[PDB]
Design a protein around this ligand. Structure first.
Ligand SMILES: Nc1nc2c(ncn2[C@@H]2O[C@H](CO)[C@@H](OP(=O)(O)O)[C@H]2O)c(=O)[nH]1
Length: 96
């Protein structure tokens, strides 16, 4: 299940960067950006395979891709943020 809606302005600024890359269709800093997210644990709504895709949210100072990600769904404005490597998700509201 989804934890709630969070305004874009309330998330780290790198979340804004990723959504900009997603709109311009990259390019992305990681070759893994844009792969399918399987939703294997059923935290998000059930959808066909390939409905969700994962993009990194850069963690300042990390050597690794860290724990932040943006999950997009195929619907208009459906984008979820996770800060704990897919444990919890919040829907992103780009209007605030
Ligand atoms: N927990 C979890 N990870 C998933 C699922 N689908 C893809 N992934 C993860 O998404 C990433 C891209 O496939 C990988 O982790 P990563 O973000 O640590 O590399 C892989 O583990 C899923 O349904 N659940």
């Amino acid at each position: 299940d989804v934890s709630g809606t969070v305004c874009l302005s309330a998330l780290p600024p790198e979340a804004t960067d990723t959504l900009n890359l997603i709109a311009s269709d990259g390019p992305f800093p990681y070759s893994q950006d844009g792969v399918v997210f399987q939703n294997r644990e059923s935290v998000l709504p059930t959808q066909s395979y390939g409905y969700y895709h994962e993009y990194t949210v850069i963690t300042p100072g990390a050597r690794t891709r860290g724990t932040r990600r943006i999950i997009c769904g195929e619907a208009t404005q459906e984008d979820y943020y996770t800060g704990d490597h897919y444990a919890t998700f919040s829907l992103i509201d780009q209007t605030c």
